[PDB]
Amino acid sequence: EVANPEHYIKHPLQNRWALWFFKNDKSKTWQANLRLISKFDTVEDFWALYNHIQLSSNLMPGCDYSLFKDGIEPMWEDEKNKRGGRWLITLNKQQRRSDLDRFWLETLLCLIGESFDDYSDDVCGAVVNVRAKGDKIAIWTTECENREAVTHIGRVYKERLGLPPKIVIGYQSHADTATKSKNRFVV
């Protein structure tokens, strides 16, 4: 005697996600600048958020977005990131105009739609940095010594983003980033 779910239920996502924002303030500690915007666990709710926030290309330089699974904080020191690393896409000044927004939207959809299939549990999140010197986008994974997981994710990422074979992307452990400056893997 009941209604048909398809007609009126929001479409759940595999995971709940947290969207964070960062504004540089020089007088403050790094960690103090990282504020949580909101969380969502449906398709409908993702788009309400995406649709009401500024596109990455219109942020002041020194601002960032990040999307992490609920319960994983967007920093190396989190339990689920500390042994991890990221696949880094360094864009140039010209690509802010032509790729920044589409690569980030693509990255958002890779996360929420679990595009990494059997390895979607190694994915922690992603970070788009808006920077005068070059914009960066990266996907964070949980364990940098899981060769098969890491490289699979890289290969799917590169392909979902449409990057040609001649553009090489690197994977670096957060441990190295935190204490040096070195690619563990390329793709």
Is 31 flagged in the annotation as binding?
yes
Angle, helix 100-112 to helix 147-160, in steps of 10 degrees: 130
Beta carbon of residue 164, minimum distance to ligand 6LI (angstroms, whole number): 26
Query: H-type helices in the chain, by residue range?
Result: 43-52, 95-98, 100-112, 147-160, 174-179
Which residue has the closest beta carbon to ligand 6LI? Answer: 75
- Relative to beta strand 136-141, strand 85-90 is antiparallel
Is 131 flagged in the annotation as binding?
yes
Q: In terms of CB distance, is 138 or 153 closer to ligand 6LI?
A: 138
Is 132 flagged in the annotation as binding?
yes
Q: Residues interacting with ligand 6LI, by CB under 6 A?
A: 20-22, 30, 34, 64-66, 74-77, 127, 129
Q: In terms of CB distance, is 49 or 75 closer to ligand 6LI?
A: 75
- Rounded to 10 degrees, the C-alpha dihedral 115/119/122/124 comes to 10
Q: Burial letters for 81-95: b for 16+ Cβ neighbours within 10 Å, e otherwise?
A: bbbbbbbbbebeeeb
Q: In terms of CB distance, is 21 or 185 closer to ligand 6LI?
A: 21
Is 180 flagged in the annotation as binding?
yes
DSSP at 145: T
Beta carbon of residue 74, minimum distance to ligand 6LI (angstroms, whole number): 4
Closest alpha carbon to 86 in 75, 70, 97, 102: 75
Beta carbon of residue 59, minimum distance to ligand 6LI (angstroms, whole number): 11
Position 186: which residue type?
A: V
Is 136 flagged in the annotation as binding?
yes
Q: In terms of CB distance, is 63 or 149 closer to ligand 6LI?
A: 63
Binding-site residues: 30-31, 76-77, 131-136, 179-181
Binding-site residues for mRNA: 30-31, 76-77, 131-136, 179-181
